[PDB]
Amino acid sequence: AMTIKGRAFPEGFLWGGAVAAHQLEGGYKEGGKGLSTADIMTLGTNERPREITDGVVAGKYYPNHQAIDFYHRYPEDIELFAEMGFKCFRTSIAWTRIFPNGDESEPNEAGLQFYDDLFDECLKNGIQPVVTLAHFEMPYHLVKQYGGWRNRKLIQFYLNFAKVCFERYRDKVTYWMTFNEINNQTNFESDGAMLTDSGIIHQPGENRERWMYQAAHYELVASAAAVQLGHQINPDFQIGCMIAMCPIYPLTAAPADVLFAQRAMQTRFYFADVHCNGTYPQWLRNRFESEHFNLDITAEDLKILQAGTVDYIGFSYYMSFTVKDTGKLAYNEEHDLVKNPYVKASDWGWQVDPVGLRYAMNWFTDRYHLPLFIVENGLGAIDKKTADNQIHDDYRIDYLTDHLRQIKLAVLEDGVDLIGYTPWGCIDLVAASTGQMSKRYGFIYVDENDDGSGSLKRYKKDSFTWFQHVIATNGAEIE
Amino acid sequence: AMTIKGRAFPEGFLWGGAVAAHQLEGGYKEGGKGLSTADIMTLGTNERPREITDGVVAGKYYPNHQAIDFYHRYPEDIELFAEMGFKCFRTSIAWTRIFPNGDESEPNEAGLQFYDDLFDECLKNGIQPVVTLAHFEMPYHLVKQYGGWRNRKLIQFYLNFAKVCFERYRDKVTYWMTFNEINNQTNFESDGAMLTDSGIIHQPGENRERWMYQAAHYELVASAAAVQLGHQINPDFQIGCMIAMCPIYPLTAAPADVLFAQRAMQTRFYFADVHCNGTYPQWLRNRFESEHFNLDITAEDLKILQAGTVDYIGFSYYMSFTVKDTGKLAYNEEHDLVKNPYVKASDWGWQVDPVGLRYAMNWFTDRYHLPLFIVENGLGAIDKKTADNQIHDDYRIDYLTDHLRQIKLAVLEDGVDLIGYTPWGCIDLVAASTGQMSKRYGFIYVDENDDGSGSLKRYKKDSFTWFQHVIATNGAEIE
Ligand SMILES: OC[C@H]1O[C@@H](O)[C@H](O)[C@@H](O)[C@@H]1O
Ligand SMILES: OC[C@H]1O[C@@H](O)[C@H](O)[C@@H](O)[C@@H]1O
């Protein structure tokens, strides 16, 4: 029964922080940038959904247009990351800075130069960029013109973008991921998931589930083609998938509940099966037939999938879910979840379950036997900044400490292969679900309110010093 | 929502029945046969354990000595199997008929001739033998002389036996399995599991768990060496493992219960991980270190394991288990199970859970992506034979029908790759746990009582006609 206190994480462990371009950069039309799917989502709340508009509508507030102005302020924000001691910085390359409309024959030089400048600023401070190519910010032109990822043509458009980035940043970036949280669209009834993952805005009469699987198929093919392409450009690239890991528990030991939870996880994680094993699960191929989807899946696609399996599994962890049998062995995330009575929840309703992260790490390890990278984890919570500009975020420290304890057990005791750990929203940024600044994740407070007002000044929260010390001690004190 | 009624199992499906040599043959010293570990186990009950004696003790009744005399009666019993329409017959080759003491330099010809005669009788009736090499009947001399599978020397002794069988029956047997229910010894406190799997009779002061893992290691190495050897002798052999598949559910959605059940299944099924993936799970290698086992595991062993992974997973299914968190993340099967309040149980306390078999089939498929073969399934129950020699075993038909429904769903809807299905104890035989005849599994009633008395006549139960019709219709009517 030996303590984990005093034992560090492995040597070479990548501590850092994670963001996405559209949530912090602002500068949404600077440098020739095109309009993205993030730029058409208005401000919402936990109770009122963001509105998805047909382009920019006069008079409406779009939080992603200016965000926190990291497009201009990155030198000073990176200084703060370096003060905390980050080894890496996980962000996205904005697709619309490189291919503003998506279907150009040549990339945008000003966009490429922006990321050279950003990555150089990181590297000058000893911080390695870790890059996600698709992160909920595809060109709105591809949505309007082609129907988004309904259209097979997007595979090549994505690959044109991937190729440019892999070549330009060949000597600057080692770790890449293809499609952020590709499996959010498991909830095929979620307008937000469908737009962010796939550029799908529902058309009357369409079969939502059918089109989700078609789009996901093309994305999986594009990912596999990109893994092969990237390795041709630089064989030392590590190219991963990115899975939203919300584990799903059975409510009870009733056999039907246990089978329903197994199918729920098969449904939410088939994307990982394809990314890692290179083949579709047969239950799901059988579903396509029994639901009469008639998907466009070719022999060439299947060959690409098998040849383009990933090097590691990047994943996010925030929460777990629970299900009971509904009477039909098919999981519909919009309707089939029940609240877990054993755990508490955040103010946005997200269940707090650190033990579930140890479960999840074992689940991925035993299924796939690949290295993992925790590329998002965090607690969205209200902060109050005091008169003397302090932020006493003990609630956020507690959440992160509790999750790190379970991660540390999974690494030291269970022997999970973990590349690194990057908390989400390390500088306060625009929330995805709601567009709120008030749902704060950061170690660094940004003085911007939900209505966009404020000085935009940055202040260190108490969690900044906490995480700085975790990094300095390589997690040794966590117990 | 299409019915499965009217849809058959796949073409080429192997229906049959399963037994083990020591449970039905009798003739325990005929033809030069040596004393086995089955021949030193006395009669018990659900409440009173079988006694394991040091060799044969005068005056005690050993049910396996004469069993049901299939050693002499096989021609007439096989006629009954052929009348039911079996495609295959799953049995073991008695290790002690081939190598009576285990360490001989040459095999026993009379033993080899017995299996030529038995297999020829099957094949003359169009029934293919399916053979398990080790099935709870190893030579007692190896236990006494070497300490059973505590001793590395048993690897070669097992391989001498395997080689002889593979060569002799090269043109008669396609499907082989190495070690029956290799994972029963997960319960390292079970005297029965330790003797039957591993030839281990506890010595005072020994660390039971440590020695279980050592023995299992040598058995896994022997299995992997045998897969390679068999394929050299006949590349068309299909050589499988044999896992006792009791799935383990969490009692509730409490995160600690879910993690404990995950570890319980990792513990009970690491054997499958080794047989299929070719490597130990890291959590378990870490356990060996933290429990200070100092196991004898060499680089050569690990190389053999990786090169000798199996062609298919043979498994038994009878029941499921449930667990709740005990406060320590280590599963001890003798103490850590709780009864599942959602299901009923047999008269020997075995939980009835057909849905769990669909769960299990998905669990193996998604973890390993190998074909499966259900080589045991059945209900041990009291039968009453009427005055007119009928046996109205509707309880047994019901159990088997309910399990076949779930199997059929797993094959037709979930797309699991299933080679065949062989109910256990197809002719009434001596129970393993207790040595009782009264715990009956068969389609064919044998008139022998728990004390060995009776005529030994065979009678068709109602389930015989039921299963004959399942085979004739290739399972099409099951709904
Ligand atoms: O992006 C953060 C989270 O958003 C939720 O809407 C999704 O369902 C999760 O899968 C995801 O991890
Ligand atoms: O042999 C039949 C059954 O015996 C029980 O004692 C074991 O625990 C099971 O794993 C096995 O399937």
Author numbering:
A (entry chain A), B (entry chain A): 0 to 478
From the manuscript:
Specifically, the β-­glycosidic bond of 6′-P-β-glucoside is cleaved by 6-P-β-glucosidase (6PβGlu; EC 3.2.1.86), releasing 6-P-β-glucose (BG6; glycon), an important cellular precursor, and the remaining portion of the given substrate (aglycon). Here, the high-resolution crystal structures of GH1 6-P-β-glucosidases from Lactobacillus plantarum (LpPbg1) and Streptococcus mutans (SmBgl) and their complexes with ligands are reported. The GH1-family enzymes utilize a double-displacement mechanism of catalysis with retention of configuration at the anomeric C atom of the glycon moiety.
The LpPbg1 structure has been determined in an apo form as well as in a complex with phosphate and a glucose molecule corresponding to the aglycon molecule. The final model also included 590 water molecules, four phosphate anions, one acetate anion and one glucose molecule. Additional anchoring points are provided by the main-chain amides of Ala431 and Ser432. Since the phosphate binding site was already occupied by a phosphate ion, soaked glucose could not be accommodated in the −1 subsite because the sugar O6 hydroxyl group would clash with the anion moiety. Therefore, it was bound in the aglycon-dedicated portion of the active site. The molecule interacts directly via hydrogen bonds linking O2 and O3 to the guanidinium group of Arg267 and O3 to Asn183. In contrast to other enzymes, LpPgb1 binds its aglycon ligand very tightly through numerous hydrogen bonds. As LpPgb1 possesses similar activity, it is likely that the glucose-binding mode in the +1 subsite mimics the binding of the aglycon moiety of 6-P-gentiobiose that contains the β-(1→6)-glycosidic bond.
